[model samples]
Target: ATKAVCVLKGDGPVQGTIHFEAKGDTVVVTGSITGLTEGDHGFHVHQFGDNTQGCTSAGPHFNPLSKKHGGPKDDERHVGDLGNVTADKNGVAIVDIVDPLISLSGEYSIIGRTMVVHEKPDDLGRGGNEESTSTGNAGSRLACGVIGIAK
Candidate 1:
């Protein structure tokens, strides 16, 4: 199985370490983040790993299929759409997601891309607005990191 990891960082105190392990057709995403406000946060894979301007340099969502923004379970969703990760009252988020769309290798591989956490919950393209179909209306990028190979 192919494995990967991403260590998140932000201007604030936000910090996290995400691990990706491929199992068959799915990639198991697990990790823990801290220093976030108590609420649901948008999580996604962006097209670029660049961080010269912090998370802003990551570019848009990794949508090689040119699909619309939606929830992880949505049929017409972007490949990078992983939906929300809720934070606890104490400002901690336990990441545990098994995604079949994302991969560590092959045409749709997410390696070298950027993982981003937003300040607000992803509307999943149901917000009925222009930004909804493209960004799920997720707010500003709170933290981000580059995905890379692991042992």
Candidate 2:
């Protein structure tokens, strides 16, 4: 099966792997990370894979379609919005999802983008706040990684 991997890089003990595996018409993203605050944290695939500026260079969300910010389940949404991942008291988080809007091949390929874990929960763009319409008001970038081809 075709697949890709993002090995997270960031401050402190934050470390993890986000694996993308092709599953026919969709892609399954499985991730496990450590060193996070105890609560919900925002997760997403960014536009560029570059981490040269410490994730800032990754650019905005992977919105080739130029849609608004939205939860993964939304009909009108950016391809990068993967929603939130909860971290436990021990500072560990795990996420597993099958997304049809993203892939390891063709139109929606995410192979050279970035993966990010934010400091706050993404309100799924339903918060009605100003930034919510674009960023879901998700707070600071906690960790970042570059998506790459996996062996």
Candidate 3:
């Protein structure tokens, strides 16, 4: 099995630590985030780990297959789209996601990429807006971290 982790940080007080464990055809993601609004936040893997210009420098979603934006369960979704993480009334979010698309070692491996948390809930590309099909209409990036190998 392959394991990895990402420590999230942002301009605000948002912070999180995400763990990725690859087993067979799926990757188990577990983590907790704090200092967010009491709502769902868009969580995705971006194309670059570069933070030279903040999270924006991470570029777009890691879509090696050139697919459209969609929900995590959607067959036509991007490889980076993992859906949303909902926060509780205390502004803490507990993440527990099992994804079949993302990989740690392979042609479409997400290693060295950026994990981003958006300010708003991911509409899952069904928002019927111009940005819906491309970005799921998710708002600004709130936090991000680089996916790195873990012991």
List runs of model 2 lying over 4 Å from the truth. Answer: none
* Candidate 1 vs candidate 2, lDDT winner: 1
Give lDDT tens digits, candidate 3, residues 26-136.
Answer: 899999999999999999999999999999999999999999999999999999999999999999999999998899998878889999999999999999987988889
Residue 62 miss distance in model 2 (angstroms): 0.5
lDDT of 2 by residue, 1-151 (tens): 3988988878767888889988777889998989998998889889998878897888888998989999989987899999999999999999898888988878788888899998899999899887998888888887898888998
Distance from true location, Cα of 105 in model 3, Å: 0.3
lDDT of 3: 0.94
Q: Which clashing pairs does model 2 show?
A: none
Deviation (Å) of 103 in candidate 3 = 0.2
lDDT of 3 at 53: 90
Worst 10 residues of 3 by lDDT: 130-139
Local accuracy by lDDT, each model: 0.94, 0.88, 0.94
Q: Which ten residues in a row have the lowest lDDT in candidate 2?
A: 7-16
TM-scores across all candidates?
A: 0.97, 0.96, 0.98
